[PDB]
Symmetry: C3
Subunit: 291 residues, 3 copies
C-alpha cells in the first residue's frame, strides 16, 4: 500500500535503477515502486521538473515522489524533503483525475524528495508546501555515501524510509524558503494583442509541440475554443488554425491542430502525424500566438 | 490477487504511463500492474495487435489487459471491453505455457479493454469472445474526459475498476459483433507449390524476421522440420535452408536459420547475428516460401 | 515477500518480457518482479555479467536473480541455478549498502539462475558459491520447452518456482565446478609502472568511461586520491587529471574528472558533459594509466 514514484536521469540500460529499487524493498518490503521515467536528459533540471509537477493528483494519498538528477553528487549538498500543500487541479479545464467527477485529494498528502538543485521549483509553485527539510540523519541516509551515486544514497534510500512512515521532521533541520534553490521560469510576455513564450517540450513519441503559454494566459487575452489563431514557432514558422479541444478536429490526416494539452498549455500538432520530427522542432524555440 | 497488463503507444520518456498507473493503484490498491510495452509505433493498430494477441495463456486467470493506441482520443468514440472465450494454445507446437505440461486456463478468464478501432481484431479471431460492451458508465470513466488522453481516461481508468471486480456487464450497453471495428488480415496465398505472404514483424532487438505464414499453412503444403526451403523476401532476396527448430541448428555463427517462431510462424534469422538490420528488412515486405 | 530480479536481452519493445512476468505471477502470485534491465547487447555475456554482479547487497535476503541471454536456446543445454556465498562489499571504498552503516547480508542468501554459458562468471568470482545445480526437473521447467525461448522456459519459469520456495537441490543434479562454463576475464597488466587494461563500459546515458582497472590495482602501484594521472584510451587519447572522488571536483563544466566509480573501478568523465559520445569511445578500447 505505500508507494514510491521514482523519476531519475539514471537511464534504463544498466543496473542503476535496480540497485535503488532493491534498497527500497529492503527498507520497506510492502512498498510499490512506480517508475515515472528514467530517460530525462542528464542534468537538465527544467526537463525533470516537467515530468514530476503533475503527478500528485493521479496517485493515492501518502505517495512519496523520489525525483533526481544529481549533478552535485559527492559534494556537501544534501537533499531536501518537502510535504506539498495542494495536489492542485490540472489538465485542459482544471479538474481532479479519475472516474466520475474525479478523486479529490487531501492537502499535505504527498512528499517529494529531491536534490536541492532547483528540481522542485515548479512543484512548489503549483502546489505550495507545508514543511521542508534538509535530509541529513544517518537513520535515513548512509554514513558513508557513495560519492558518484547520491541519487541512490540521498534520494532513493531516504524516500523508502519516508514511505515506511519515518517522520518527515526527523530527517534533518527545517529549511527557510530562500535555502531552497530555484530556477528562473521565463514569463509569458504580452506584445500588442500577441502572447510570446517558448516551446517547453516536444511530446514524444508523437512529435506534438507544447508551449509554456497557459490557458489562463489565453483567457486573459480574449482567446477560447473556436478562436482562429496564428502561432509562430522559431520566429519563422507561422501556423494558423482554430483552437480546438483535440487532434481529430483538424479534419484530414496530417492537418494542423492547435489545442490545449493535458496540462492546460497551448499546443500544436498534426492530426495522426508527427509535427516536430520532420521539421526538427526543439524545446527552447520561440512561440508567439495571436488572433 | 488482481492484475492489469498494460500496453500503450504512450512511450517511456515522460510521465504519461505513470499517471495511468497512479490512477490504477488509486482505484485498486492491491493490483499488480505489468507493463507489456509502451513503444509501439503510434496509431499502428496492426502492430499493437501483435503484442497483445498471445498474452492470455501466460497470465493468471482474471487478468485484465488494458491495451491502447487511441488516435480517436477526444471524439465521441468509446472503448470496448471484452471477455474472451479461449485462452488458446500457442507456440511452435500448440501447447499451454508453464512448467510440466503447462497451466491450462479456464474459458472466459480474461478481459481486454481497448479503443474500438480494430486493436482487438486478432484477439477475437484467435480467442473468440463471450461478451462485449461499450464502456460508457461514469462509474468507470470520467464525466469530463481529458480530450487528448483517452488512453488514460477510457482504457486505464476503467481497466482498474474491472480489475477491482466491477461487473463487466454494467460498463455500458452490449455490442453487436458488427459494431466491433476490425482490420483486414491479409490471407496467405498458394501459388503453384509455393505459399505467399508477408514479413509481419522484425523481432527486436535481434533482427530476426517473422512472416505471417503459419505452421498450419506449412503442413497443408507438405512441409515439416527437415524440409529444404526457398524463402524469398522482398521479391528478390531468395534464402535457402532446411526448416529447423532453432537458431543454433544453422551451424556456424552468421548462418541462415529458417525456423518456427514462438507463435508458430515461419521465420528467418542468422545464427547469433542480426539478419534484418544490416539489410534494412521491414515489416510489410513480401515473403514467399517453397520446397 | 519474495522477489525476482530479472535481467534479459529480450528488449523493451514487444511482449517477450511480459510473457515471462505473467508466468512468474502465475507460479508465485505474491512475488515482486524487479526489472534490472532488458537492453543488453544480445549474446554478449560479458556485458550481461556486468549488470548482475553487484546486485546482491542491494536486495533483501532470499531474492532470486533470473539473468539471461540465451543464444543456445533450443539446444540440449540446461540452465544452472547457484546459491552464492558472500553478498560481498562493493563500491569505491568497500562497504554494505543502505542507510546508517549499511544493511549487512547473511551468507547464502541469494540465488542466481542463468544459462550455463558464462554469464555468471564474475558473480562466482566476486561472491563464490555454496551449491550449484543443473536445472532439469519438469516440476520447474516445461516438458516441451519452446525452442526459441529458453530465456522464458529455462530461466524465468524455474526462477519463479525457486522464488516460491521450491528446494534448490531438487531442480536437478549437482554441478562440478568445471562443468560451470566461464569466460576469460582479461587481467590488468603492469608495464613499467603503468597499468594496462580496457574500457569495460560506457556509462549510459552520461557517456562516462569505465575501465577494468580496480582500486586494488591502483593502490598496489602507489596511486590514491590526489595522484596526478595520465590515462590513455585507444592507444592515442591521453588525458591528465588528478584522481578525485567525484565529477564536480573537476572545476568548470566540461572539465575532465578521473575518479573511482561506484563499483571501485578507474573511470573518466567530463564534469556535467558527456565524454564518450562526442568522441565515439567504445567498450573494448585499450586503457593505460600511470602517474
Ligand atoms: C557535474 C556532474 C556530473 N558529471 C557527470 N559526468 C555525471 N555522471 C553522472 N552524474 C550524476 O550522478 C548522479 C548519480 F547519483 C546522476 O543522477 C547524475 O546526475 C554526473 N554528474
Ligand atoms: C488523430 C490523431 C492524433 N494525432 C496526434 N498528434 C496524436 N498525438 C497523440 N495522439 C493520441 O493520443 C492518445 C492519448 F490517449 C495516444 O494514444 C495517441 O495515439 C494523437 N492522435
Ligand atoms: C545463437 C543464436 C541466436 N540467434 C538469434 N538470431 C537469436 N535471436 C534470439 N536469440 C536468443 O533467443 C533468446 C530467447 F530465449 C534470447 O535471450 C536470445 O539470446 C537468438 N540466438
Amino acid at each position: 500500500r505505500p508507494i514510491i514514484a521514482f523519476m531519475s536521469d539514471l537511464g534504463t540500460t544498466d543496473d542503476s535503477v535496480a540497485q535503488c529499487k532493491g534498497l527500497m524493498y529492503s527498507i520497506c518490503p510492502d512498498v510499490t515502486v512506480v517508475d515515472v521515467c528514467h530517460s530525462m536528459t542528464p542534468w537538465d533540471v527544467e526537463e525533470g521538473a516537467r515530468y514530476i509537477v503533475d503527478l500528485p493528483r493521479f496517485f493515492p494519498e501518502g505517495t512519496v515522489f523520489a525525483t533526481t538528477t544529481y549533478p552535485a553528487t559527492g559534494t556537501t549538498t544534501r537533499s531536501v524533503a518537502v510535504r506539498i500543500k495542494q495536489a492542485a487541479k490540472g489538465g485542459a479545464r482544471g479538474q481532479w483525475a479519475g472516474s466520475g467527477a474525479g478523486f479529490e485529494r487531501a492537502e499535505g498528502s504527498y512528499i517529494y524528495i529531491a536534490p536541492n538543485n532547483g528540481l522542485l521549483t515548479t512543484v512548489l509553485e503549483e502546489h505550495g508546501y507545508l514543511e521542508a527539510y534538509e535530509v541529513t540523519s544517518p537513520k535515513v541516509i548512509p554514513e558513508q555515501p557513495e560519492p558518484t551515486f547520491y541519487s541512490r544514497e540521498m534520494v532513493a534510500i531516504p524516500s523508502a524510509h519516508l514511505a515506511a512512515g519515518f517522520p518527515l521532521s526527523e530527517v534533518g533541520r527545517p529549511l527557510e524558503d530562500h535555502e531552497i534553490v530555484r530556477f528562473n521560469r521565463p514569463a509569458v510576455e504580452q506584445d500588442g494583442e500577441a502572447l510570446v513564450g517558448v516551446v517547453s517540450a516536444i511530446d514524444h513519441p508523437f512529435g506534438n509541440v507544447w508551449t509554456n503559454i497557459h490557458r489562463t494566459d489565453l483567457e486573459k487575452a480574449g482567446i477560447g475554443y473556436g478562436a482562429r489563431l496564428r502561432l509562430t514557432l522559431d520566429g519563422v514558422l507561422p501556423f494558423e488554425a482554430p483552437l480546438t479541444p483535440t487532434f481529430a478536429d483538424a479534419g484530414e490526416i496530417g492537418n494542423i491542430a492547435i489545442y490545449l494539452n493535458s496540462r492546460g498549455y497551448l499546443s500544436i500538432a498534426r492530426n495522426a502525424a508527427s509535427l516536430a520530427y520532420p521539421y526538427h522542432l526543439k524545446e527552447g524555440m520561440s512561440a508567439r500566438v495571436e488572433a
